[PDB]
Amino acid sequence: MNIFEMLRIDEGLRLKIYKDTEGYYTIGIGHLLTKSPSLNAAKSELDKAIGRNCNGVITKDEAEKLFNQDVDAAVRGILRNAKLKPVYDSLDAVRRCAAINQVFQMGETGVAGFTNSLRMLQQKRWDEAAVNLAKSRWYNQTPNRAKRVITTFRTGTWDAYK
Ligand SMILES: OCCc1ccc(F)cc1
Ligand SMILES: [Cl-]
Ligand SMILES: [Cl-]
């Protein structure tokens, strides 16, 4: 198991513009296109990211290219964050995948407000951080996914991904 397969399991893969769980236009492997509700805005963003007139559809290779850049941007976002960096580096390799996942899903922003969780994770209080992480909108709106990430943080193994 690695970050890619993990994320691929959590986000799925779609080659046509779709609405995410929050109703926003997205494509590929969880690549958000825009928060605006104009489909045309979305198609525009799509062409811009892909470099060609897509007309709302892309190929698998194109989706995977987006995915790569997006994984990369997330890590890098983590590393550049002063509140994030230190926690991230204190964790083992599996748990670091759980961190990337959350970031990928919610932005460096969203995560940066999980202050108590961050601290608990940094002190390695697994069970405590798991309970704390559950007390969030994130868990409440996408519980099945959240559960898997949480378990990952809690255990440091890929069991939830089986
Ligand atoms: O709860 C967020 C857990 C987390 C830890 C480190 C990091 F870089 C990003 C997210
Ligand atoms: Cl791009
Ligand atoms: Cl879910």
From Swiss-Prot:
InterPro entries to which the protein is assigned, alphabetical: Endolysin_T4_type (IPR034690), Glyco_hydro_24 (IPR002196), Lysozyme-like_dom_sf (IPR023346), Lysozyme_dom_sf (IPR023347), Phage_lysozyme-like (IPR052619), T4-type_lysozyme (IPR001165)
Keyword check for Cell wall biogenesis/degradation: no
SUPFAM superfamilies: Lysozyme-like (SSF53955)
The entry's keywords: Antimicrobial, Bacteriolytic enzyme, Cytolysis, Glycosidase, Host cell lysis by virus, Host cytoplasm, Hydrolase, Viral release from host cell
One GO-annotated biological process of the protein: cell wall macromolecule catabolic process
Outcome of swapping N132I: 5-fold decrease in enzymatic activity
HAMAP family: ENDOLYSIN_T4
The protein's name: Endolysin
